[PDB]
Amino acid sequence: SDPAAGWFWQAVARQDLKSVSDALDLDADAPLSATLPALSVWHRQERERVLADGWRYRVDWVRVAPQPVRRTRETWLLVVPPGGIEEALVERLTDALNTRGISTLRLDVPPAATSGELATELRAAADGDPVKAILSLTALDERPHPECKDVPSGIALLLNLVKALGEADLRIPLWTITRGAVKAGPADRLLRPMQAQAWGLGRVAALEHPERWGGLIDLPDSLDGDVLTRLGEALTNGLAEDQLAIRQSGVLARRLVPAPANQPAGRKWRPRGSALITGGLGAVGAQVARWLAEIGAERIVLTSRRGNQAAGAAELEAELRALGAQVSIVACDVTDRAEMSALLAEFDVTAVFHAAGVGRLLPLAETDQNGLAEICAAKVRGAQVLDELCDSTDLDAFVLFSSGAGVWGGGGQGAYGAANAFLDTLAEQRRARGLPATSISWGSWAGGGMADGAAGEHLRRRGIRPMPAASAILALQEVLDQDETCVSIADVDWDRFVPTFAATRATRLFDEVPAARKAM
Amino acid sequence: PAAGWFWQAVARQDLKSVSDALDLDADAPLSATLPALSVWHRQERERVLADGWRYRVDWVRVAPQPVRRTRETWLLVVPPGGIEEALVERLTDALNTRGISTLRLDVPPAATSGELATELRAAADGDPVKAILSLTALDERPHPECKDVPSGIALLLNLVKALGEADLRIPLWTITRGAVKAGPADRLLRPMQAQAWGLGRVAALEHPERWGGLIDLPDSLDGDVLTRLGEALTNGLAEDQLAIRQSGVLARRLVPAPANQPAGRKWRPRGSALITGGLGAVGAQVARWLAEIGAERIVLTSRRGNQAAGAAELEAELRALGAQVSIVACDVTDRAEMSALLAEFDVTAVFHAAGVGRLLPLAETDQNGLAEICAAKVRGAQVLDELCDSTDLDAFVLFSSGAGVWGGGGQGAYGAANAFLDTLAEQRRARGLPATSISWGSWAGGGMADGAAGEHLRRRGIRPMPAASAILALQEVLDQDETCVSIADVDWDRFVPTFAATRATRLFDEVPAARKAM
Ligand SMILES: NC(=O)C1=CN([C@@H]2O[C@H](COP(=O)(O)OP(=O)(O)OC[C@H]3O[C@@H](n4cnc5c(N)ncnc54)[C@H](OP(=O)(O)O)[C@@H]3O)[C@@H](O)[C@H]2O)C=CC1
Ligand SMILES: NC(=O)C1=CN([C@@H]2O[C@H](COP(=O)(O)OP(=O)(O)OC[C@H]3O[C@@H](n4cnc5c(N)ncnc54)[C@H](OP(=O)(O)O)[C@@H]3O)[C@@H](O)[C@H]2O)C=CC1
Known part of the structure; x- marks a missing residue:
């Protein structure tokens, strides 16, 4: 009923002057007459402070068990923005999607593409071949467009891409790749806040158009070894994880976790x-x-x-x-x-x-x-x-x-x-x-x-x-x-x-x- | 409880009370205030603990349900002092009304466990004795060579021991009249007879084998009280601590007795x-x-x-x-x-x-x-x-x-x-x-x-x-x-x-x- 008063009497027994005088904001020599006022204030406040403790949460990343290998060949559309991306990276991704069944169809987006224009490109690629999903790279394009300084150009593109799938009536899962938008463990230092915007939007895209929305994946700094293989399996997880990070230690999924403050x-x-x-x-x-x-x-x-x-x-x-x-x-x-x-x-x-x-x-x-x-x-x-x-x-x-x-x-x-x-x-x-x-x-x-x-x-x-x-x-x-x-x-x-x-x-x-x- | 007091005293905002509850002045440093608090609180705590040490004896109304019995013989043991023949006669008739047959032993004063064993031996070969009903605790007057000790209680003891020296393993039920107070306006209260309950409760533990229970008869034997007596002796549900009153048959219970302020x-x-x-x-x-x-x-x-x-x-x-x-x-x-x-x-x-x-x-x-x-x-x-x-x-x-x-x-x-x-x-x-x-x-x-x-x-x-x-x-x-x-x-x-x-x-x-x- 009153954990505050609980801890107080547990400090009173134990005889913790240190804890109590800290708690009351007082020196060991303070007179009772200053002690009483400081007590009632601490008491109102401690009870609200205990309430608020149960309001805390942080974001953890939990290891997702590997469950492949699987499936037969599908076509994905790979969407590449005009900036922010090295050709070497597209090739490595393309080459790693190929070595796991996924055939690639590359669409290159013009600067400041509209939802109308993209729906057209989507309509054309859709009719050509049998597209199962879209892997969007556009969020790596951090630079603003000069016409619109306050919006990163790749995030303008994500937006128009979610809408373009609608205009096209295209009902096909969109997967959004980022590199450095999340901190998935201590040791992540590539942190790219303009790319975090994709995650903030994406979660909402997921709620508003679940049918259009595959998920979000964050690539690491170092792409050596097997990380790119884990990408391929992450895209297929069949656990319905939709917020993923791929690291040296495998595929990680995003959790929200109670974060009660451990004193002092x-x-x-x-x-x-x-x-x-x-x-x-x-x-x-x-x-x-x-x-x-x-x-x-x-x-x-x-x-x-x-x-x-x-x-x-x-x-x-x-x-x-x-x-x-x-x-x-x-x-x-x-x-x-x-x-x-x-x-x-x-x-x-x-x-x-x-x-x-x-x-x-x-x-x-x-x-x-x-x-x-x-x-x-x-x-x-x-x-x-x-x-x-x-x-x-x-x-x-x-x-x-x-x-x-x-x-x-x-x-x-x-x-x-x-x-x-x-x-x-x-x-x-x-x-x-x-x-x-x-x-x-x-x-x-x-x-x-x-x-x-x-x-x-x-x-x-x-x-x-x-x-x-x-x-x-x-x-x-x-x-x-x-x-x-x-x-x-x-x-x-x-x-x-x-x-x-x-x-x-x-x-x-x-x-x-x-x-x-x-x-x- | 204390605490609830303290916190409102604290809430707003009163030096006087807080200062008084703890032996110290408005001027006292916090390093003296701590210890004083721990000691106040510990005393207040012990107050609660000692509250939960309280018990009282209540008496719970229990209509016996087991009629069901048949017919057998009891030994009925009668002291020299303290019994009306009229009483022995009412009890014999009630026991006979309910199938029990009655063998009467008059016990000499100052009877030893030895002498008692003999008669008990004799009674046990002569007859299939199913239980023993002692009235000895009625005999409140002191032992012949023993001022400090009521006759009836020295007899009860010697009786308990006597069953010992004749290994009979048959239950002893002890009747009192006014040994216990089973509700208000019980006014026939007989402290010498209460001793039978104190010894008896221990006898039950030391010689379960040998012990039936304890039953306290009321002032007046009219209405059904004699009826109910028969019921209580053959209820067996354990229940070995019993009173019989105008308003029924009552069992003895120990009950937490928290002080109920003011x-x-x-x-x-x-x-x-x-x-x-x-x-x-x-x-x-x-x-x-x-x-x-x-x-x-x-x-x-x-x-x-x-x-x-x-x-x-x-x-x-x-x-x-x-x-x-x-x-x-x-x-x-x-x-x-x-x-x-x-x-x-x-x-x-x-x-x-x-x-x-x-x-x-x-x-x-x-x-x-x-x-x-x-x-x-x-x-x-x-x-x-x-x-x-x-x-x-x-x-x-x-x-x-x-x-x-x-x-x-x-x-x-x-x-x-x-x-x-x-x-x-x-x-x-x-x-x-x-x-x-x-x-x-x-x-x-x-x-x-x-x-x-x-x-x-x-x-x-x-x-x-x-x-x-x-x-x-x-x-x-x-x-x-x-x-x-x-x-x-x-x-x-x-x-x-x-x-x-x-x-x-x-x-x-x-x-x-x-x-x-x-
Ligand atoms: N209210 C809530 O429950 C929550 C609020 N927040 C966040 O807390 C913050 C405060 O919200 P709240 O106080 O509720 O909102 P208010 O709308 O009351 O205040 C936000 C203020 O931002 C000022 N502002 C807007 N643009 C600029 C600018 N270009 N430069 C400088 N100042 C600017 C506005 O003033 P002016 O127009 O005069 O510039 C406005 O007064 C917001 O950032 C909100 O995102 C978050 C979660 C919950
Ligand atoms: N200890 C406990 O926890 C409990 C105690 N009690 C009761 O408290 C009472 C005393 O307990 P406690 O103090 O522990 O025991 P003690 O032995 O300390 O005290 C008993 C005292 O009674 C005195 N006494 C004995 N016989 C006589 C007599 N004929 N005339 C006058 N005084 C006599 C003794 O004095 P002297 O020998 O000098 O004559 C002795 O000092 C007892 O009634 C006990 O039954 C009850 C429950 C628990």
Whole structure:
């Protein structure tokens, strides 16, 4: 009933001054009169902290048992984007699909192909020979198109490819290959966040058009030995794994795993100097701001395109100043490198919180390259800009506000899932460079903001329970204290979530969440 | 529970209470606050534990269903004193109504197990004797050459042994009348007869073979009470501990007795408190507790008096908690001396802890042993009961044992003596005088559960209670103004299998723990 009070009395017996005085934020010599107040606060907070512990999840990778060899010869269409890919790689893949039955039919995509044009190429290849599946390589094409700077050209291509299979009425599994979009074990250092976008989108493609969608596979850095053979068997798995990574140690499948925090944490995180929240005048940024003020940030810099013009801006400066912090509210687009650069240097910021972003529910079929740009630009490109600046092990915190939409997905959330899966890989890439980064993909928050709409209705109806802001904050604190990289923090009603989520499409994604097992 | 208090005290936000519960000031560092918390919490915890040491005896309505029997012969054993021929005649007729035929043995006074064996030998060849029904426990008057010991109980014993020397292996059923209190307004209460239950419960364990059970008849034999008597003797469902009342047949059950707040009053002495056997182990603790809660004075008595180990040492502690102390050489069984003591010290609160403890199989037991074990405990209580005729007296407390409630191997005499105490207290209550009987499991420390004897009870499932918490329980019982309560820490999973080792029992069916050990 009360594990907090449990642990307290278990510390009281045991006589752990160290644990208790840490817990209460007090010195061994503190008077009872300071001790009592600190107790009631710890008590309210510990009970919410224990609640929030059960909201944590991480992404693991589990070994998938080899089960080949098998089958007779099929034709696959191999789709190759205009950039990002070495001929030597196409040949090695082609040659390894051949040595396992799969005959290859190569389609080369022109730059900025439309869904109309691709459906034509698909219609032609479909009639020619008997195509069983499509192996798309287009996600390796990271460069933006110059017309549309904020979208990687291969992700524009994936999109138009999912739509083109529709326009063509083509009912044929699409498989999406990436190299470095996931971290599947310690030792992965090829991390390519623009390619993670394929995974964020792909999970949604899988829900919206299960019939069009084979799966996602991540190739390793080193393609020596047998990895390319394992590719061939991965494409045929018949275990219905649809999120795979191929490594030195074989084929690995993506799982979501409860990640309860094993105590204690190795620090109590506090901002030193200035803290920056981009999108700091939104619902979530306002909370993050109140928290920083409460825990003694000397200055909070809040940015947004509207800046001081933003509804609530003057309320919020008042509240923050009433808690003793200095406040700077600036109008600044995240995507503007010079303005952000001047900004960081002027205030000497020591902690960055990236909350700039837009939410919109929009089916993949209704999404185009501009919509994708509209949704991604501040989140993704604001994250690169921040990453480029901040070339610095000194920073206390480089915290990205991501979403469950980017970790497991949901209908309507192609572009948003893409933008969010980028951040999780960006955070991993940064760590691999020796920099700090933290990416937290939230379930919805109570209060205003992105989960407040009829949108909040949709998400409640899918079995995501909004988290009280104060408990969300407590969980952020915890992540920061724990010095974590990626962790997902959501209050999910598994009874209701799973049946909705797995209506159209089976998934092994949640096999390791007990409450999710129960729910069919 | 405590905790729930603490957390709201903490919640918002009160130094005063928290500061008071822990002996320390608003200024105290956290490194003193910790230890103080652990000690508060540990005390509060032990309070809960000592709450779960409580049991009482209830009596459950059990209509016997087994009619079904046929016809046979019982021996019916009748003492010299305490029986109306009218009674013997009602019982003979009821036993004959239900198929049982009746052979009457009148037993000479002071009959030895030897003499008894003979007549039993004679009865057993002359007739196919199926059971034996003793009425001897009715004979309450003391043994001819043995003031300290009721005739009927010396007979019962000698009877148990007698079956021994004639290896008859036929069951003995013992009838009492008013030995037990089976519901409110049972007012015929006969402590000498209760001794039969204490010994009997032990006889059942030491000689299952030889033991039928115990049945208590009511005041008035009208309506069906004589009918039901026949039923109870041939119910056999075990059930060997039985009362018969206007409202049916009742079986004896041991039942957890959690304190059911509030606690009516907060008890303290108003004058001199006397503890008989006050220089024994338990005497010393209780005395420390009294002296602790503000007794003007404390009289400790004992045959040894001042020449007992702990002599002045004990007194020093007491004087030094701020008490007056009179250690007197006094024999509780001595009426004259005891009268003088209570007048002399205007004593308004009594705690009877004089007793004697040994483990002794029934077969090694005789009148003299029965007298050594009982004299102080029983005649002591009697003497204290005779004096102390005032409702003014705040306490009247009897230090009894679980050996008298459920029994154990080797504690026949001891069980008899304690059983006497429980019933006595009920009798005083019935007469409008205060009285309290607590039947303790074993205490940690010196005294009766100290030596080999503590080890013995250890193996049997009795966990010795820290003196300090036994005191917690005592205090509660007085505050609660209760009459009879058992207080013991029983490790049931060990207790049940060794207790019910040779003989089944229904006595614990109402203890949740006890049932998960069969
Ligand atoms: N609310 C929730 O439950 C969840 C939110 N999140 C994430 O948390 C973040 C905050 O969401 P929430 O607070 O709910 O949303 P809000 O819509 O309230 O705030 C987001 C803010 O981002 C700012 N922004 C947009 N574009 C830019 C830009 N180009 N440069 C700088 N700032 C910009 C916007 O302000 P302006 O227009 O003035 O520039 C807006 O105020 C979002 O990134 C969202 O992805 C994640 C999971 C759940
Ligand atoms: N120890 C335990 O755990 C339990 C104890 N009890 C009861 O508590 C009581 C005492 O226990 P405890 O203190 O452990 O045992 P002790 O032997 O320590 O104390 C018994 C004391 O009674 C005194 N006594 C014996 N005979 C007489 C007499 N004729 N007149 C006056 N005093 C006498 C003895 O003093 P002296 O020898 O100097 O005459 C002796 O000090 C007993 O009734 C026992 O039945 C009950 C249940 C459990």
